[PDB]
Amino acid sequence: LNCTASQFKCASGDKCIGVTNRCDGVFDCSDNSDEAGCPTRPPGMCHSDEFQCQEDGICIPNFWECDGHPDCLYGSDEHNACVPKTCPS
């Protein structure tokens, strides 16, 4: 018998782990079918959701960009070109 859609049916079929553990960085079931299809695709550039810092390229969440805090090595996340409004209220 099958399992719920929330339970990712592993290609092995041994364990029907949840989709929350599908591509979660953890080999939950056999053959790593949960993590086999991980579309990280970092071709030297960070993922779309993660801002790539200018000086070093270290990936940070895009929310950290122009967040009022120099998360970057040189604060390129708070780059002068941004001029964010960043209303405290």
SS3 assignment for 20-73: HHCCCCCCCCHHHHHHHCCCCCCCCCCCCCEEECCCCCCEEEHHHCCCCCCCCC
Distance separating alpha carbons of residues 12 and 60, to the nearest angstrom: 34
In terms of Cβ atoms closer than 10 Å to its own Cβ (0-12, 13-18, 19+), residue 72 is buried
Which residues, listed in sequence order, are joined to residue 59 by a DSSP beta bridge?
52
Identify which of 61, 58, 37 has the alpha carbon closest to the alpha carbon of residue 49: 61
> How was this one solved?
cryo-EM
Annotated binding site for Ca(2+): 24, 26, 28, 34-35
Resolution value (Å, 1 decimal)? 3.3
Neighbour count for residue 10 (Cβ, 10 Å) = 21
CA 13 to chain centre: 27
Residue appearing with tokens 């070093």: 56
In this structure, is the dihedral angle defined by the CA atoms of residues 48, 49, 51 and 57, taken in order, positive or negative?
negative
Which tokens belong to 43? 């071709």
CB 6 within 8 A of CB 17: no
Annotated binding site: 24, 26, 28, 34-35
